[PDB]
Amino acid sequence: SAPQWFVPVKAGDAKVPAYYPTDDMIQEQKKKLRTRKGAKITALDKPAWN
Amino acid sequence: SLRPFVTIYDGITGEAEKTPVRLPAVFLAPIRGDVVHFVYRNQSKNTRQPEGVSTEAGKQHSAISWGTGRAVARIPRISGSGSGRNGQGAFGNMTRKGHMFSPLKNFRKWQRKTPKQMRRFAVASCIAASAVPALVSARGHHIAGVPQIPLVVNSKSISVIKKTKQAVYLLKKINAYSDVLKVIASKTVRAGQGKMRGRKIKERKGPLVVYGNDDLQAVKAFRNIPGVDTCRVENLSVLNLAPGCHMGRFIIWTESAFKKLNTIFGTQKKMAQGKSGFRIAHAQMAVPDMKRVVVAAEKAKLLRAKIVLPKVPKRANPLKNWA
Amino acid sequence: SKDKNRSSHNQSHKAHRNGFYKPKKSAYMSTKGMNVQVLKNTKAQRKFALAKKLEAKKAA
Amino acid sequence: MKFNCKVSSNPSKARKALYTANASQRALMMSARLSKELREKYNVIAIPIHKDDEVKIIKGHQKVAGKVTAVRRSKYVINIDKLTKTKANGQTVPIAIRPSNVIITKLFLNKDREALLAKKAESRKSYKELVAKRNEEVAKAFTAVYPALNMDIFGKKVEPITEKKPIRIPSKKMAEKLMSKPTLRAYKTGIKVHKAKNAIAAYKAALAKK
Amino acid sequence: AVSNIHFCKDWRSKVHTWFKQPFRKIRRHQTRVEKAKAVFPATI
Amino acid sequence: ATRFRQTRRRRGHVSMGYGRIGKHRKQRGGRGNAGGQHHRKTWFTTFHPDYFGKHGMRVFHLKANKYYCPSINVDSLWSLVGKDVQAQYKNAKVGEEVPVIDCVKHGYFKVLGKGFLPKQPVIVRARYFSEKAQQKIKAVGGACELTA
Amino acid sequence: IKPKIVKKYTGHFKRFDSNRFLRVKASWRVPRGIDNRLRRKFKGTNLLPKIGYGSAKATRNMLPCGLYKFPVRNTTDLEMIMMQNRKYAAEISHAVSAKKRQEIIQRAKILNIRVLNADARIKKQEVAQ
Amino acid sequence: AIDLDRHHVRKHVSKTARGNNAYMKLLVRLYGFLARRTQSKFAKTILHRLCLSRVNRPIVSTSKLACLMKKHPEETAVCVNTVTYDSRYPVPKMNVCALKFTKTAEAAITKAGGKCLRFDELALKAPTGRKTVLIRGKRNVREALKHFGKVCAKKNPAKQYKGKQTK
RNA sequence: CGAGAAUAGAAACUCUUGAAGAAGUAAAUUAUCUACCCGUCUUGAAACACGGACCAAGGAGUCUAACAUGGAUGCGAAUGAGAAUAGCAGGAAAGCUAUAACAUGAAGAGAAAACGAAAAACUAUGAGAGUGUAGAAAUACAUUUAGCAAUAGUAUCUUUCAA
RNA sequence: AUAAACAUACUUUGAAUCGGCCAAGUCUGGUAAGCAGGACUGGCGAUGCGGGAUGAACCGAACGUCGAGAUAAAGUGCCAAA
RNA sequence: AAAAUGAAGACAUUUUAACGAGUAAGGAAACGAAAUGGCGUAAGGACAACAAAAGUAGUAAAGAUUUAAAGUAAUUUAGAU
C-alpha cells in the first residue's frame, strides 16, 4: 500500500524519477476540506439543547 | 578470539581465492575519535612553510613626534619637506604605510610534536574504522557494490598491472569505480584568494590503495587516476586514513599488505613487531553493547517497571469549586 | 592631598558574607604541650597494648 | 604530476615568461594543426605557422578560409585577408585571430619547411616504434601470469563482482555512536530518504503488476 | 616560582632556526654515498 | 588557538577586563624580581622565605660525577631479572646454583634496604651496601658481593 | 491546521544614537558607557533585547503560511522533505539558474510540496505574453 | 522581590562522562540506567565515580588489591580507575574489575590464575553488586599537594616551587 | 431529610464580515503620554569638565622562552627519545622505523664529611553488601558483615645539633 | 524555641579593589560651614520604577515579555486619575 | 534543581517547582540528559544529485541599491533593479 504521506499526482509529460509511478495508474482524488458534521435535525416539537 | 575469515579476490578474473585469511587483530582496536582528533590537529600543521614580514618593514623612517602645541596628535611624523609624505604619520601601528601590530616572525612554531604511542593509537583506531561500512559511507564513499568492506585483492593480479588502463580495469572489477567517478564528476575550482597562490582545482577523496613491499611497480599505474591515493602499509598515518579529521577512509588492501598487518601492529595480547613498544589497547568496555546487560537484569527480575509520570492536576479553588 | 585615615564601615558586612569559619573538631584534640608525665603514661600503655595486639596477629 | 625540479608550476611565473619571451621562442608557440589532406601526406600533426599559408578558421563568428597576410608575434596573433572590418570612415583593417583557432590547408614550403617536415615525420615514427616495444613487454608479463587471457580484455566492458560476502565485526553496533551530530543527522536522513524511495518504488511495482 | 629568564640581551639576533635540518640529511647522505662510490674502502 | 582566547570574548568591553579605576599600565611594581626587599618583601617572605642570604660552603669547581650513585632497595632487586627467573630459582638453598643480580650492569651502584625480600636465597653484586640492606639479604639466606 | 503565532514585539531593536549619526549603524549593540541613558534604563529609553521577548517554542521560525523554510538547490534536495510536506516548504536558493528553477518547480508539484520562490526569475512573459 | 540567602547556581556535581570517549559514554548510559531502575546504592556509586575527572580517579596497584582482598577470598575488587602493577611484590589469585589494566598488571593478574574484568561484564554478572568490594586509590599522594599553601606558615608549610637560585 | 453503596438518566450549537482585500504587519502624517550629549576620569556630568564638522578604508592583549594550576588524551615504575643523528619506500621541509646518550620520576635528609627508611603496622568515624518484619505504592525499622577515600591521633624506621 | 539537603564543609586557580560620598532620636575640633575626622547600621557609588513640581542619597519599593485585579508612599478645585 | 524517558525523534527531550536588577570583574573549546548558548570575517583539510557524470553559475557569480520574511539579539534568508 502507499505511504500515508504519498498522494501521487499526474505529470504532464514532465521528467519523473524511476520510483514515481506513471500517470496511467495514477488516479486523481478530489481535494477534501470539510471535516466537521452539520447539526442534526430533530423533531419539530422537541427543543434544542442550546 | 574466533576472528572471522576474510576473502581475497582476483582483480582480473573477479574470482575469490580458495584460501580465506583471518581478520587481523588491528581491526578490533577501539575507535577513539578524540584520540584521532588530538593527533590529526597536531600532525596537519607539520607541512607548513615558514613565513614572515620584512624585519625593517614600516620602520625605515627617521620620524619623531612634533610634540604638543601644534594642534595635531602626538603620533610620530615624517621629517623634511617637499613631498606629500613629509609631515604624515609614522611607524605607529594604526598609521598608513607603517608597521602593523606585532610583526609575524619566521621563527614561529610551525611544526607540532606528538608522542609516538599516541600516534600509533590513532592509526589503529583509524584502521579499525575503515572496516565499518556505516562509517565508510557516512564519510562520503560509494561502497554499496563492493563485496567486502575490508576489501583485499590478490597479490597475483596486482603484479601484472603496469598501465593506467589496467589499474582502471581492476578498479571496475571490484566495484570500486563508483568513488573514482564521484571524484571525477565533482571536480571544481576553489572559492577565494587561494587561486592566486596556485591552488585552483579542488577535488574530493577516493579509494586508498595500501600496498606492500612486493607492489612497488603497481604504484605508478594508480597515481594518475583522479581521486586515487596510494600509500605503503608501513607509512600509514592519520593524514591518509582520516583526511579532514573524518575517520573511515575507503581502503583497498593488497594481499601482501593485508598479511603484514599482524606483524606490524601486533594483536591485543602480543606486543607489536614492526612498531616496537606498542600494543593495541583494550576498549573501556568488553562488548560495546548495552542490550545484553538489560535483558539479563530483566531476566533476574531486578529492574522496576517503566514509570510514566502522572499528570499533576491543575490547582483549583475548593471554596468556589464544589467538585 | 589629605585623605581619609581609616574606617570600619562595611567591615562587618564583609566578615559575614562567608561567615566566621569555626575550627574543626581536630583543632580541640591536639596534644602538643601536654603534661610530660601524662604523655609518658599514655605512650607506655599504647606501646604495651600494641605489642599485645600484634602478638595475637603473629600467633594467627 | 611534474617531477622535474627545474620547471615551475607557478601560474604567475608562467605568464611572465610568456610575455617576456623573445622572438625565438615566440615562433614555436604560434603553431597550428594541419588538415586531413596534409596530415596524410606528411604524417605531421602541427607545425609553426608561416606567412602566405592558407588556413581555415574553425572557431569564431566567421569560419572563412583565407591566406595568412601577417604573423604578428608581439601580439601573438595572425591576420587573414578575408577577415576585415571597415573602420567607419571607409578603410578596412584586418581582424586579429589567435593561431589556435585555425588549421592549415595549404603550406608555403620553400626549403626549410621541407627539412623541418621530414624531421617532424621521423620523430613520430621513432616514438611509435618505442611505444610498441614497451607495449609488448607489458603484454608479455601479463601472459606469464594469466596464460588463458589476452591484453584486449582491458579495452572492452568490465563485469563487476556481484558476490556480496558479509563480515561480522564487533563494531557495527558502535557505528551510530561513533559519528558526531552533524554527520549522524545526515546519515540518518539518507537512510530515511532511501527507505521512502523504496516504499514508493514498491507501491508502483504493485500497481504495475495489478 | 622565581623567574630566571635571560632575554634582556638582544636575543632576536641570537636566534638560530633549524630550517636547514631536513636538507643536512640529504647533503650528508648523498656525500656519504659519493665517497663510497669513489673508493669504497675509504668510507669504511 | 587564537579563537579560544579571552580577547575574542571581550570585544565591545572598553577595558578588556583590566579595570577602569586601575588601568592596565606598563608596570606593576618593577621589572623582574625588583623590590625583593622593599615592596615585594611580603611576597618573598610568604612564598620563598629563604631566598636572601647565604648558606653552606662554596665548591669552586663541583665534580658532579663523584656524587652519582643510583640506588635500589631490596624489595626492588628481583625486578631486575623478572618474576620468571624468580620463580625458577624459588626452591634453592646453599650448595646448588643461585642467580646473581648485577646491579652495576643495570646502572645501580648502591643497594638500600627497604621493604621485604622474597624468602629465597640470592647473590647481590653491587658497589655499596647499607647496613639494613645486608641484614635483609643475609636474613633471607643470601650473600653480598662487592664490585669495582 | 495552523497554530496562532504570537509575537511579543513586532518592531526593531535599533542601536542607540543610530538616528542622529550616520556612522553608527542600526544593528544592535549593547551600550557599555558608564553614563549611558539606555543602559541605565531611564524612562522613555528603556528598550533592550532581553530573553523574555522570545517567541513561543512551538511556533518559532515558522513562516506565516504555517510551514518551516527548507532551502533546496536541485530536484534531488526536494526528496529530503518529500515525506514532510505538511511541515516544510521548499525555498530555491538565490543562485539557482532559471533553467534549474523550472525543474524544481515542476518536480515539487509532483511531490505536492509548497514552494515560496515560485515566481522567481520568470521570463519576460508579463506584458503581451 | 524575595529575600533569599543566595540565588540558584549550578550544582557542582558531574552527571555525565567527561570528554568524548564513546565507550565511557556508554558505560555512564548503562549505569545511569541500572541505578535508576534497580535503585541500588552500588550502581549510584559506580555511576558517580565514572563521572569524576582524571585527577580524582587515582590508580590502585596490584599490591594494594592483594592486601584488601586478603580476607575476601571469593570476591571481586571493583575500582573505577586504572590498575597499575607493583613489581616489588607478588600478585595472588583474585578477580578485579577496573576501567583499564596496565599491560604488566593484566599479565600478572592472569598469570596468577585470576581474571581481569571490565565494567560491562561486572554489570552483566553482578548488576546490583553482591560479591564485590569497592576500592579507590589514595588522593593525597599527588606531589602537587605539597606546594599548596604558604611556605612561610608556622604549622604546615608548603614546598616552595623551585626556581632562581633555590637553596 | 438523608451521607456511603448499589441500580438507572439526559451535550453538540446560532448569526455577521472577508480576493469588490478579513486578521495581521510595514511606511508617511496627525493626536495624548513619554524622551537632556555620546565616550571618559570622577563621590558626583546633560554640564559653564575634556575629545568629537561629515563619510569611507586602516586601527590596538600578539609571538618566542621558563614555571604553575586546571579540563580532554596515551602510557604507567616508568614516560619521553620528531637529542642530535642513521635508515626506508617515492621523486616527499610530509609519513614510517631505529633496545639509546639523556631529561623528569621511582628516596630522603645534611653546610659538608659521612649516611640512607616496617611492629608484612594500630585507633576513631566513615563508602558498600545481605536477611527479617511492617506499612503497604514507594518506603520505614530490626539485625549480620565489610570497612576503600578523607581527616585526626598513635607506635616503628632514615637523615639532622635540631622533625 | 525557630529555621536549615540545590543544607553544610570546603580545596585549587584567579579577576577587579583599597581617591569614596550621604542620612542620623550619634561623637570630637571649630563661631560656624554643602567644614575636618570617627563608633553602629542602611544606602548612593553599581539603581532603574511610583511620590516629594525639579534633585546620587529622602518615602514606598528594587526590574525577563505581557493581560487582569487588589495595593504602597502619597493624594482627590483646574493643569491631574481620584 | 529533582523526578521520568532516552540510539537519534528534536525545538538542546517530558513534567513539576523556585527563580530573572546590576558598574569593575568572571564564566576558553569538547563533554545525551551535555561544567553558559550562539552570530559574523578570511584562509587550509574534508563533505554537498549515492544508480557510472554527484553543491551553484552566461537560462547570469561576486558586488551594489531597496522590498519583504525568520530570529529577543548578533545576523540570516528571498524577490526586484
mmCIF file of C-alpha atoms in Angstrom, chain H residues 4-121:
data_model
loop_
_atom_site.group_PDB
_atom_site.id
_atom_site.type_symbol
_atom_site.label_atom_id
_atom_site.label_comp_id
_atom_site.label_asym_id
_atom_site.label_seq_id
_atom_site.Cartn_x
_atom_site.Cartn_y
_atom_site.Cartn_z
ATOM 1 C CA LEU H 4 16.887 34.743 49.534
ATOM 2 C CA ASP H 5 20.137 33.750 51.203
ATOM 3 C CA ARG H 6 21.656 33.042 47.784
ATOM 4 C CA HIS H 7 20.484 32.692 44.206
ATOM 5 C CA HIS H 8 20.240 29.453 42.253
ATOM 6 C CA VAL H 9 23.578 28.454 40.723
ATOM 7 C CA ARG H 10 24.605 25.225 39.013
ATOM 8 C CA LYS H 11 25.311 22.365 41.397
ATOM 9 C CA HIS H 12 28.987 21.412 41.255
ATOM 10 C CA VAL H 13 28.472 17.693 40.646
ATOM 11 C CA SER H 14 29.229 15.978 37.350
ATOM 12 C CA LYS H 15 26.406 13.953 35.822
ATOM 13 C CA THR H 16 27.891 12.534 32.593
ATOM 14 C CA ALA H 17 31.168 11.163 31.249
ATOM 15 C CA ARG H 18 33.851 13.812 30.862
ATOM 16 C CA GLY H 19 35.333 14.029 27.396
ATOM 17 C CA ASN H 20 34.375 12.397 24.123
ATOM 18 C CA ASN H 21 35.154 8.745 24.892
ATOM 19 C CA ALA H 22 32.423 6.761 23.146
ATOM 20 C CA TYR H 23 32.911 3.706 25.363
ATOM 21 C CA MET H 24 32.968 5.688 28.600
ATOM 22 C CA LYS H 25 29.825 7.463 27.407
ATOM 23 C CA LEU H 26 28.059 4.110 27.048
ATOM 24 C CA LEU H 27 29.187 2.953 30.491
ATOM 25 C CA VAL H 28 27.539 6.001 32.056
ATOM 26 C CA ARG H 29 24.471 5.255 29.943
ATOM 27 C CA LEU H 30 24.486 1.696 31.280
ATOM 28 C CA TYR H 31 24.929 2.533 34.963
ATOM 29 C CA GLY H 32 22.672 5.572 34.812
ATOM 30 C CA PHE H 33 20.022 3.128 33.623
ATOM 31 C CA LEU H 34 20.861 0.500 36.249
ATOM 32 C CA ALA H 35 20.902 2.956 39.155
ATOM 33 C CA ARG H 36 17.577 4.463 38.080
ATOM 34 C CA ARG H 37 15.815 1.107 37.656
ATOM 35 C CA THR H 38 17.427 -1.179 40.242
ATOM 36 C CA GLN H 39 17.695 1.742 42.712
ATOM 37 C CA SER H 40 20.836 0.132 44.140
ATOM 38 C CA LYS H 41 23.306 2.292 46.041
ATOM 39 C CA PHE H 42 26.150 0.355 44.399
ATOM 40 C CA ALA H 43 25.163 1.442 40.891
ATOM 41 C CA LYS H 44 24.705 5.010 42.129
ATOM 42 C CA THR H 45 28.253 4.810 43.493
ATOM 43 C CA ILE H 46 29.782 3.410 40.299
ATOM 44 C CA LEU H 47 27.838 5.923 38.214
ATOM 45 C CA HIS H 48 29.117 8.783 40.367
ATOM 46 C CA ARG H 49 32.743 7.633 40.276
ATOM 47 C CA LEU H 50 32.590 7.222 36.497
ATOM 48 C CA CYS H 51 31.878 10.962 36.225
ATOM 49 C CA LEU H 52 34.908 12.230 38.152
ATOM 50 C CA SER H 53 37.834 13.914 36.449
ATOM 51 C CA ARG H 54 41.028 12.013 35.705
ATOM 52 C CA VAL H 55 42.865 13.504 38.689
ATOM 53 C CA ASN H 56 40.084 12.361 41.041
ATOM 54 C CA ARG H 57 40.278 8.710 39.882
ATOM 55 C CA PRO H 58 43.713 7.726 41.208
ATOM 56 C CA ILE H 59 45.336 4.416 40.408
ATOM 57 C CA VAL H 60 45.353 1.265 42.527
ATOM 58 C CA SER H 61 48.281 -1.135 42.327
ATOM 59 C CA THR H 62 48.195 -4.922 42.490
ATOM 60 C CA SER H 63 49.922 -4.776 45.879
ATOM 61 C CA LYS H 64 47.071 -2.721 47.326
ATOM 62 C CA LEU H 65 44.458 -5.038 45.829
ATOM 63 C CA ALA H 66 46.183 -8.065 47.359
ATOM 64 C CA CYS H 67 46.140 -6.540 50.843
ATOM 65 C CA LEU H 68 42.466 -5.551 50.616
ATOM 66 C CA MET H 69 41.487 -8.953 49.171
ATOM 67 C CA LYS H 70 43.355 -10.987 51.792
ATOM 68 C CA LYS H 71 40.333 -11.760 53.976
ATOM 69 C CA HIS H 72 37.993 -11.754 50.951
ATOM 70 C CA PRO H 73 38.962 -14.884 49.003
ATOM 71 C CA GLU H 74 35.976 -15.248 46.657
ATOM 72 C CA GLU H 75 35.204 -11.603 45.934
ATOM 73 C CA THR H 76 35.554 -9.133 43.070
ATOM 74 C CA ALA H 77 37.520 -5.957 43.695
ATOM 75 C CA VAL H 78 35.799 -3.069 41.916
ATOM 76 C CA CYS H 79 37.839 0.101 41.371
ATOM 77 C CA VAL H 80 36.791 2.740 38.829
ATOM 78 C CA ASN H 81 40.349 3.658 37.844
ATOM 79 C CA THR H 82 43.406 2.308 36.071
ATOM 80 C CA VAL H 83 45.109 -0.561 37.903
ATOM 81 C CA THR H 84 48.896 -0.441 37.707
ATOM 82 C CA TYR H 85 51.402 -3.139 38.643
ATOM 83 C CA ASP H 86 53.614 -3.148 41.735
ATOM 84 C CA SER H 87 56.664 -5.076 40.564
ATOM 85 C CA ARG H 88 58.093 -5.262 44.085
ATOM 86 C CA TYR H 89 55.541 -7.707 45.487
ATOM 87 C CA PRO H 90 53.833 -10.883 44.250
ATOM 88 C CA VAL H 91 50.274 -10.907 42.934
ATOM 89 C CA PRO H 92 47.926 -13.594 44.315
ATOM 90 C CA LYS H 93 44.852 -15.075 42.640
ATOM 91 C CA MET H 94 41.958 -12.618 42.525
ATOM 92 C CA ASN H 95 39.328 -11.191 40.182
ATOM 93 C CA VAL H 96 39.440 -7.442 39.526
ATOM 94 C CA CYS H 97 37.050 -5.179 37.628
ATOM 95 C CA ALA H 98 38.582 -1.884 36.523
ATOM 96 C CA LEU H 99 38.401 0.670 33.736
ATOM 97 C CA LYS H 100 41.857 -0.125 32.368
ATOM 98 C CA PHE H 101 44.643 -2.582 33.163
ATOM 99 C CA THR H 102 48.332 -1.956 32.614
ATOM 100 C CA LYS H 103 49.960 -4.445 30.242
ATOM 101 C CA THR H 104 52.128 -5.699 33.097
ATOM 102 C CA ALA H 105 49.258 -5.652 35.595
ATOM 103 C CA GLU H 106 46.984 -7.652 33.293
ATOM 104 C CA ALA H 107 49.736 -10.210 32.706
ATOM 105 C CA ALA H 108 50.465 -10.532 36.431
ATOM 106 C CA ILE H 109 46.807 -10.941 37.410
ATOM 107 C CA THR H 110 46.147 -13.501 34.675
ATOM 108 C CA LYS H 111 49.337 -15.479 35.328
ATOM 109 C CA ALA H 112 48.337 -15.939 38.975
ATOM 110 C CA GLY H 113 45.067 -17.577 37.919
ATOM 111 C CA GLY H 114 42.861 -14.516 38.360
ATOM 112 C CA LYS H 115 40.668 -12.551 35.992
ATOM 113 C CA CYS H 116 40.580 -9.022 34.581
ATOM 114 C CA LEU H 117 37.004 -7.824 34.101
ATOM 115 C CA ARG H 118 35.526 -4.717 32.536
ATOM 116 C CA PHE H 119 32.548 -2.872 33.951
ATOM 117 C CA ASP H 120 30.050 -4.274 31.446
ATOM 118 C CA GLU H 121 30.877 -7.846 32.470
#
